[PDB]
Amino acid sequence: TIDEGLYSRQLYVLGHEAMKQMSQSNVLIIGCKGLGVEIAKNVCLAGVKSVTLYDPQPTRIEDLSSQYFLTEDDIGVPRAKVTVSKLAELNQYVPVSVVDELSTEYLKNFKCVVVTETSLTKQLEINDFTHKNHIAYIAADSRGLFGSIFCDFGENFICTDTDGNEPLTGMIASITDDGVVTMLEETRHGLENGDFVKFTEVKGMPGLNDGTPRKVEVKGPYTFSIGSVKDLGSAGYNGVFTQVKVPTKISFKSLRESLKDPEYVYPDFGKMMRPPQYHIAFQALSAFADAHEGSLPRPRNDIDAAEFFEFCKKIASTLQFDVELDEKLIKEISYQARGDLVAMSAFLGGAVAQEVLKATTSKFYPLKQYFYFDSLESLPSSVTISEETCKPRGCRYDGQIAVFGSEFQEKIASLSTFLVGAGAIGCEMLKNWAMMGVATGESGHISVTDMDSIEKSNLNRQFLFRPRDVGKLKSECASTAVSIMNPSLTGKITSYQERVGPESEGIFGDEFFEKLSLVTNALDNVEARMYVDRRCVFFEKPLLESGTLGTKGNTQVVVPHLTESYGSSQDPPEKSFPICTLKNFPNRIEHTIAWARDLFEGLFKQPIDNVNMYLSSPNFLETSLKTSSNPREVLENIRDYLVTEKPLSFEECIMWARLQFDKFFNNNIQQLLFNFPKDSVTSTGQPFWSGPKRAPTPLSFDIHNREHFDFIVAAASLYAFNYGLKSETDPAIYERVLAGYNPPPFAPKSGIANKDKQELKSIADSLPPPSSLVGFRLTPAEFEKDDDSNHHIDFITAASNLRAMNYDITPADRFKTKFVAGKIVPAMCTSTAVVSGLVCLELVKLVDGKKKIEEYKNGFFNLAIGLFTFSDPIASPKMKVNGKEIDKIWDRYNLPDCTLQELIDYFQKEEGLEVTMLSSGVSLLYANFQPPKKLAERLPLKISELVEQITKKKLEPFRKHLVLEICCDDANGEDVEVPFICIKL
Amino acid sequence: ALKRINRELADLGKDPPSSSSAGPVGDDLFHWQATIMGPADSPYAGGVFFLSIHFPTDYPFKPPKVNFTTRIYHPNINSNGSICLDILRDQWSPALTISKVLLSISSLLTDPNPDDPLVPEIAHVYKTDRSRYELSAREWTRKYAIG
Amino acid sequence: MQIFVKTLTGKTITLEVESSDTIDNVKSKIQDKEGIPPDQQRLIFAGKQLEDGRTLSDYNIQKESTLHLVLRLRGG
Numbered sequence A: 001t002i003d004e005g006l007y008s009r010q011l012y013v014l015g016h017e018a019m020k021q022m023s024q025s026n027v028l029i030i031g032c033k034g035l036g037v038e039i040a041k042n043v044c045l046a047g048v049k050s051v052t053l054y055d056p057q058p059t060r061i062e063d064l065s066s067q068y069f070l071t072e073d074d075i076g077v078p079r080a081k082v083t084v085s086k087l088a089e090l091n092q093y094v095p096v097s098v099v100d101e102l103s104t105e106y107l108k109n110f111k112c113v114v115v116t117e118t119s120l121t122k123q124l125e126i127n128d129f130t131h132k133n134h135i136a137y138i139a140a141d142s143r144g145l146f147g148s149i150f151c152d153f154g155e156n157f158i159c160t161d162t163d164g165n166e167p168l169t170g171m172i173a174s175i176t177d178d179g180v181v182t183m184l185e186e187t188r189h190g191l192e193n194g195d196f197v198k199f200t201e202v203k204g205m206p207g208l209n210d211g212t213p214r215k216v217e218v219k220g221p222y223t224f225s226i227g228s229v230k231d232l233g234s235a236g237y238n239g240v241f242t243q244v245k246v247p248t249k250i251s252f253k254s255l256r257e258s259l260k261d262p263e264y265v266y267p268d269f270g271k272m273m274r275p276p277q278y279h280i281a282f283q284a285l286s287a288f289a290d291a292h293e294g295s296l297p298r299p300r301n302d303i304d305a306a307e308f309f310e311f312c313k314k315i316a317s318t319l320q321f322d323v324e325l326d327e328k329l330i331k332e333i334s335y336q337a338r339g340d341l342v343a344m345s346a347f348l349g350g351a352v353a354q355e356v357l358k359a360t361t362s363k364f365y366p367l368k369q370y371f372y373f374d375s376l377e378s379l380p381s382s383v384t385i386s387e388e389t390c391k392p393r394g395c396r397y398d399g400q401i402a403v404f405g406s407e408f409q410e411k412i413a414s415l416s417t418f419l420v421g422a423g424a425i426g427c428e429m430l431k432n433w434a435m436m437g438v439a440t441g442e443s444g445h446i447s448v449t450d451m452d453s454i455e456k457s458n459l460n461r462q463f464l465f466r467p468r469d470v471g472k473l474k475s476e477c478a479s480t481a482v483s484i485m486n487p488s489l490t491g492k493i494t495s496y497q498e499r500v501g502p503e504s505e506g507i508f509g510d511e512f513f514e515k516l517s518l519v520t521n522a523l524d525n526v527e528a529r530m531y532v533d534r535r536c537v538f539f540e541k542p543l544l545e546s547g548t549l550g551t552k553g554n555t556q557v558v559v560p561h562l563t564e565s566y567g568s569s570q571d572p573p574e575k576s577f578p579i580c581t582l583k584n585f586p587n588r589i590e591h592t593i594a595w596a597r598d599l600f601e602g603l604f605k606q607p608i609d610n611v612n613m614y615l616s617s618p619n620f621l622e623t624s625l626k627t628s629s630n631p632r633e634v635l636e637n638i639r640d641y642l643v644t645e646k647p648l649s650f651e652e653c654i655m656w657a658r659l660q661f662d663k664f665f666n667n668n669i670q671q672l673l674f675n676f677p678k679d680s681v682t683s684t685g686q687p688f689w690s691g692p693k694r695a696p697t698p699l700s701f702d703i704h705n706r707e708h709f710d711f712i713v714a715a716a717s718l719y720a721f722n723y724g725l726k727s728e729t730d731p732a733i734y735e736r737v738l739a740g741y742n743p744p745p746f747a748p749k750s751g752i753a754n755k756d757k758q759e760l761k762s763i764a765d766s767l768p769p770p771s772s773l774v775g776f777r778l779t780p781a782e783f784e785k786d787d788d789s790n791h792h793i794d795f796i797t798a799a800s801n802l803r804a805m806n807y808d809i810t811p812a813d814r815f816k817t818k819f820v821a822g823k824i825v826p827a828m829c830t831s832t833a834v835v836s837g838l839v840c841l842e843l844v845k846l847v848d849g850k851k852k853i854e855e856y857k858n859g860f861f862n863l864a865i866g867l868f869t870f871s872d873p874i875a876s877p878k879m880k881v882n883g884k885e886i887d888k889i890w891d892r893y894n895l896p897d898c899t900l901q902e903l904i905d906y907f908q909k910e911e912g913l914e915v916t917m918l919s920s921g922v923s924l925l926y927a928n929f930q931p932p933k934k935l936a937e938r939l940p941l942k943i944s945e946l947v948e949q950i951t952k953k954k955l956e957p958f959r960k961h962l963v964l965e966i967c968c969d970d971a972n973g974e975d976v977e978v979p980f981i982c983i984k985l
Numbered sequence B: 001a002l003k004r005i006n007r008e009l010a011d012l013g014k015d016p017p018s019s020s021s022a023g024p025v026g027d028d029l030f031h032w033q034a035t036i037m038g039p040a041d042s043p044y045a046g047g048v049f050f051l052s053i054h055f056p057t058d059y060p061f062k063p064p065k066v067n068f069t070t071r072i073y074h075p076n077i078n079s080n081g082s083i084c085l086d087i088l089r090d091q092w093s094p095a096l097t098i099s100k101v102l103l104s105i106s107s108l109l110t111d112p113n114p115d116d117p118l119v120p121e122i123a124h125v126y127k128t129d130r131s132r133y134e135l136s137a138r139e140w141t142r143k144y145a146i147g
Numbered sequence C: 001m002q003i004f005v006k007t008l009t010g011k012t013i014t015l016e017v018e019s020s021d022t023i024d025n026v027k028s029k030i031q032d033k034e035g036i037p038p039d040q041q042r043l044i045f046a047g048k049q050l051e052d053g054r055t056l057s058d059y060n061i062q063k064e065s066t067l068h069l070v071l072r073l074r075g076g
């Protein structure tokens, strides 16, 4: 009973059983500051049964530094009371409550307990209870640029899924007598030692088909071993194997036992000596607070730092810790104790919310047990950070001024950012910018562009949008929401509904880009990423890239004249199947789904487009007869969809659907088995239908069968939609119409001059004249996965399952069919929060203008396994041109709008290079091998004139420059690479 | 993409392919027309086959789209000109040149593969009645490839 | 020398190398064991991304070292 219209993208990450168990779990959250509210928001969006908040502390102004559900009108009111109202709106299936008083025995009502902003004695008191009563306990802390997480799920935690990957499966070629399983040609099993597999369809060894898992001993990328199969048989042929994932038992220690001998999770292997330092430092913070009436050290105070370091020494001595304390790092922890950064809050809240989901679903591997993190490389160095500049000013940015200072706040308030995309990452980025105070000064501005509209499935991870906002523009809603969060952003956000690409360069032109300070990408495709990367390279602007997939995520930073661009590296491409496999010899459900999608396009989209283009273009037939691969196909489509098989009622649509069923599931299979009988052999004597090729069998139509009826219904409905008729869903009419159907006889054909042109002419003139059909059009079907009443996914599922039945492939359901056909990207709110936090931690590095490349970090993570890793960006490659140092990425030539001859002469005289090729856009302006006449005609023209002439398209008035690619050869003839040319018009 | 495309074009200029000749259409570098000569020891002897090559915006990180324009009677080439070649669907790597693709297509022409066919009827004729396949291929290359 | 490579999806790989091996040889070995072309591999050791043309000793990679094999993602 899960609402798949809302949890569509999250179900592809977690699953149905996981979310069913998750919707029966109660979560208590202690603390309602930025970290707590982030955790509660992510939990409410995830879909737990209910959330209870406990925070009776009255609101303070500084609390607004990372709490985005608090306003300045709420000062003096308990934080939970003012937060519950806004949290109750995120998800309608998750009630949110408040408790004014907490007792120990009251904790038994909750599946998970999250603790923030609590002293160590209270944490020990709570954990001593939750540990012996088997309640999951998570404790999180965020101090300036430092963070800590602790998880304790009990002594006998059971984890069903450990890595979150789909089970591995593969086709076998042979199994010897000693269990040596071999894969097919050039196929990798992908297993690891100790995995368990089960076999099916193994011929010659039926015993392996029982279904008992067996140990795997990997011997190579193509073979493995399972043991001894002497008794089961001598040798086995063909078959498939599927991995079996076994539950694991994880044993946690209590907080009291874990303080003495902690187990660390390392977010970065470059600094493996720090977590032991942070373990002492956070305990010293708790002791200091207990010794000063719950007051943390004041910002950048040396007396408090000295006292804190004395506490650290005392704690390290007491715990028998054999670690030499790094005084600078520990005192840094002391200085930033009162810091409250929205980026750290977002990062830790995403991590902790994922841990809560792990606790409530018993899926994915949890943290064991301490996770200490720092982003100390983000501390500014271009400004003064002292006790005078970091003291509070009684404003909403006190939690950030306590870390960065007032001068850095002035630097932040003057940013002019450009955000591309307004989805999940875009919403998180806008919220982080609003909390940080970005572009709230006299010279600050924010621009956000996005061409899409809000849908129901977007509300599951884009928390700025409500159900009332469905159908509106994403950018307008996001700007309004963040202007509500921070009122100082009123009049300083501009929203566009333009797609960023070659067609929007009149809006995001030179004037627009020259005023920016940085560009942040929040996109979902690589083409737009590459385009924005090229624009940033040309204008020399910093770029912040980020991406997510399920529980995985990454963030990258591109810095002018320092690092390489986003397009300097390659990613694995999308996998496309061979056409022969798809058309004739499928063996996976993905092949049949691709075939079904192509069938949908070929039945309901292409013929309609041809018919419509015939009735619009007066010279369509003449052009198509010579500019098409199959003009005969176009003519046949037009004839069939106009005259021959035009339905005058829905019954004719039903009969048409029945005919198409026969055509695509009974007759083509008969023809295929006529060409390649089941007993046929290859050229080497091997059977033809063996291994990856599965022998099909024709389907006979049976109305009582569910898949056949589904196909008929969906096909008839889509045909009626094409012709604008009134469809029906009652099975009575279908059964009545299909009862009186006489299939035409079919017999597969054995096969065995220039008059065909006359036949094509006769077909063409037989069509009704376009003049007789004015104002008549057929409605094409545009694929739409997200609507469940247009019969698109229904038709694709029915066709895919029927073709699977043809080849004896295991059919799927509508859920997996929608996942595959729709090319849906699994999405999570926790991963979005983590990536936004990392991006906003790099943003402050960009604002400070750090020059060294070791101060920046590209981040990668997978929350399913609890893996975090960071690495320095790659420096842009250098080169030598005319004995000069040239950056291969960020350098260019600036030339006036000279002539082609003058450009060549300039490159000869100045750089000592001979120009061989000159191109602009997708045109070849000049090549060394062109005939002398063409060159002599093209030499005395200016570059703009040459481009206009070659492209036959005048340059637009807003076009202020041209980018030219040039390939040149040196005097010796060696090819030397040079940077691009920027011609100024 | 432009740099590598021009490098390939110049290399084609620097070495006569003899059996092939590819070049941009007009002045567009993302649309080439290539010519292939039927091998002498093949049913397509003395035939000129035109192919259209479409370079994607992501070249060389995505395969070029190569389609026959001349009608050919081959088990691995259908009526739309689609070619059953692995290096064009999922075995493409950013290290293959157009000359290699043309050599692969010529090798495909000189001997078909009926065991993994794209046109089952032509493959059936090839496997069972070879002489009829020879006559049909000769007729098709005389009718369409010569003009 | 024997080193370990951990993927972003949790898989573990064991490579038998020597301190004088270049990063290209290690990438070729990873391709052999995984089928990932060297130009698409992102290897991280101790917070540094390994670049082609250098040796293991340039990064002070010794026996039982752990590398991370990562990749970029396209959602958002």
Ligand SMILES: *P(=O)(O)OC[C@H]1O[C@@H](n2cnc3c(N)ncnc32)[C@H](O)[C@@H]1O
Pocket: A420, A421, A422, A423, A424, A425, A449, A450, A451, A452, A474, A498, A499, A500, A501, A522, A523, A524, A525, A528, C075, C076
């Ligand atoms: P996620 O898939 O949740 O949201 C991605 C958002 O990015 C926007 N987007 C994609 N492609 C473009 C271009 N080319 N220009 C501007 N915005 C883009 C989508 O509309 C989503 O809102």
Ligand SMILES: [Mg+2]
Pocket: A452, A453, A455
């Ligand atoms: Mg959308």
Ligand SMILES: [Mg+2]
Pocket: A524, A825, C076
């Ligand atoms: Mg998307």
